[PDB]
Write an enzyme that holds these catalytic residues in place. Structure first.
Site, mmCIF file in Angstrom:
data_model
loop_
_atom_site.group_PDB
_atom_site.id
_atom_site.type_symbol
_atom_site.label_atom_id
_atom_site.label_comp_id
_atom_site.label_asym_id
_atom_site.label_seq_id
_atom_site.Cartn_x
_atom_site.Cartn_y
_atom_site.Cartn_z
ATOM 1 N N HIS A 141 7.252 -7.544 4.364
ATOM 2 C CA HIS A 141 6.112 -7.167 5.207
ATOM 3 C C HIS A 141 5.001 -8.173 4.926
ATOM 4 C CE1 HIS A 141 7.795 -3.269 6.529
ATOM 5 N NE2 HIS A 141 8.480 -3.396 5.406
ATOM 6 N N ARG A 185 10.325 1.788 6.697
ATOM 7 C CA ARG A 185 10.828 2.269 5.412
ATOM 8 C C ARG A 185 10.847 3.774 5.233
ATOM 9 N NH1 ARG A 185 13.529 -2.235 4.538
ATOM 10 N NH2 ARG A 185 12.151 -4.065 4.683
ATOM 11 N N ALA A 231 -4.645 -0.243 7.367
ATOM 12 C CA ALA A 231 -3.921 0.898 7.936
ATOM 13 C C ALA A 231 -2.940 0.589 9.066
ATOM 14 C CB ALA A 231 -4.914 1.957 8.406
ATOM 15 N N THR A 260 -5.872 -2.251 16.806
ATOM 16 C CA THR A 260 -6.833 -3.111 16.122
ATOM 17 C C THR A 260 -7.927 -2.400 15.316
ATOM 18 O OG1 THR A 260 -8.113 -3.458 18.192
ATOM 19 C CG2 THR A 260 -6.389 -5.059 17.669
#
Lengths: 208, 213, 220, 214
Positions: free
Chosen positions: A77, A167, A157, A53
């Protein structure tokens, strides 16, 4: 503006903006601006134990130019913000080397040529339909999946690391791998500690 | 930027990414015309470009206000730990004027003292429990909902506006209205064009159309 | 299915969409049953779990009705990828019940007073806060204001709609010794129901993806 | 319940969790009820009217959709939902393309007869597809060869979405401003939604629906 990495023949990944840095995660983790190295140690601790978080408080905005088949995979995504273009017309033509390892009946050079050819025909047909008054939204449906599109991508991030886990991997298509490598590169540049800790404890892929 | 709210609370801006032009840039995927664009997007419901403006706030508020706040799920929150975090043990005590407006059997300042009294009794019991060896995660369950907590809030402009539509409004509890006003103030200073367009074209609440900034 | 938790709480299953096969159909993107094969279907569930292909499990959804102390609810609500609908403290008529820790709860910690006393001490302060609250209410004070003196162990209720993928993330974090004992109890109940409705997914989960400790120790 | 869309597409209901009462129970945070439609549907309108849509997040649908990629790309822009798109990795792949009907070009004064535009599209599609097969034959992997296929290639996906997110979808796609192709898919979705949640759907049209075609 800012960093730009060219991908494929005409693509790219450009860093538009970035909010925060490694310290932003530290501050959020401690929940303090005044009482926000023991800090790099905290970053590793959070990463090791999966306390993701705090990393949501580091945000990036990228401008990406990629073929539609890459964009479609990318757009899966969901935890991020996208804004796609809606106008030049360029297409991704694989280089002969891209066929590295495949024993093709015909030369690699020829495969690249065949691809350039149907792209050509599809595009000329598109321009023809347009000229005759056919609506763009309709005429464009004959264009190939290697047509380049562009979009802005704002992502934190934490979501970016989940993106790289999927990926930035040999099991992902080479084209998307290349873009993921570029994204990882920029991420590394702006958030050294987070990126290093990510590779050390959480990175699930194999190419970084 | 740190705006004091209620008796001991506050809203503080930690960081911000972009400004009005970030949405223009996102819309175009690339002077006065940029403002015209912001206005156009707001007028026709094209909210996605505003997702590219992001803020990180540090908020100190009563738990009952925090709980209402956290219902706005499209954002990132990091709050102090009730189990392991050090607290200030401060509590929101409504001012007599807060009550005024409602016919009560006793004077408003009386209602204020009784609240302050029960809070004092709860706090005392808490410390008594701690000193006795009772773990914080358990001992703290006796503390009242008006206890102050703190959290970091990272949210994009689109979501921030949705928050203001619902919280910067008469239907929301007065306490959170006060926080929403502070959020709106900071939002306006950082994104004046988006903010004005928002009030003129998308703001569903009512208080910001009368309350300055 | 309704399981009691703590002294006055519970986890109740309200509804559920799909079963293990819902993940299989989604993975194959096929609404064809004329080819059912338990062996192959169960193998696909393990395969997805083992290789981290989580999206198919998003097509299995649950709705629970949970009654828990506010301090527990707060920790729970931090799991954002789900939908919650809680009673309104400002309007909804509460039943006003509170979580009173059992002496066994503290049993295990060196205290300067018998565990029994802690329980009595907590029950006492709760009673006092509650009376004040009513006293404030009987005076015409809005409940949205009077309720702020109530302790964090006050019980609340909420409906929770979550898909299997998010549910597994929840269990990873809450069905673990690191989580507070109270929320651990709720997580075990959620796991029990989850296992009942999606046995194949739950087993594959425990085998390849579950990050916690307690579920591999405690049955069902 | 299946509804054909375009020339080779469709929208079919795979599953649904709950109905109008699921939103009611959620709003009231109570499982039981005992006996009152008038009161139930009044609550539903009350919620819709004041913008209290969280209760509708407790009604869920799973759809199986077959649509051209260009339509899917627009569809997938709705992030608050779950998607699983067809993959040769778990199922067999099919190759069909959306060929617009001459009527699709009505209202447009094209120097090319609408029926001839239909023909030119089929033409390019057939050639792109043939090149594709030829590449496959030469030993080029599918992931590379398929990049020459047109945006009108049909794809399939499972879509799980709650009623709230579903209404937002309709607000944007079930409207004359959305491309015609997506409008047709949105109509089908609206039809199935109305069938399973008549009360919620009626209230939606009355107080919240922002579009125009519904």
């Amino acid at each position: 503006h800012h960093m730009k990495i060219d991908i494929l023949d005409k693509g790219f990944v450009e860093l538009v903006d970035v909010m925060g840095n490694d310290l932003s995660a530290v501050r959020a983790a401690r929940v303090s601006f005044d009482m926000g190295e023991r800090d790099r140690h905290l970053i590793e601790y959070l990463m090791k134990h999966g306390h993701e978080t705090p990393f949501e408080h580091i945000v990036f905005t990228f401008h990406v130019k990629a073929p539609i088949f890459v964009a479609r995979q990318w757009f899966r995504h969901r935890i991020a913000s996208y804004n796609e273009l809606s106008l030049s017309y360029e297409f991704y033509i694989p280089s002969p080397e891209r066929l590295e390892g495949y024993k093709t009946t015909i030369p690699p050079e020829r495969v690249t040529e065949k691809i350039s050819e149907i792209v050509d025909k599809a595009y000329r047909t598109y321009l023809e339909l347009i000229e005759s008054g056919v609506p763009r939204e309709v005429a464009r449906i004959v264009l190939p999946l290697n047509l380049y599109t562009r979009f802005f991508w704002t992502v934190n991030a934490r979501s970016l690391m989940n993106f790289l886990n999927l990926r930035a991997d040999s099991h992902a298509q080479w084209e998307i791998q290349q873009y993921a490598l570029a994204i990882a590169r920029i991420f590394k540049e702006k958030c050294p500690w987070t990126f290093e800790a990510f590779l050390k404890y959480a990175y699930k892929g194999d190419i970084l």
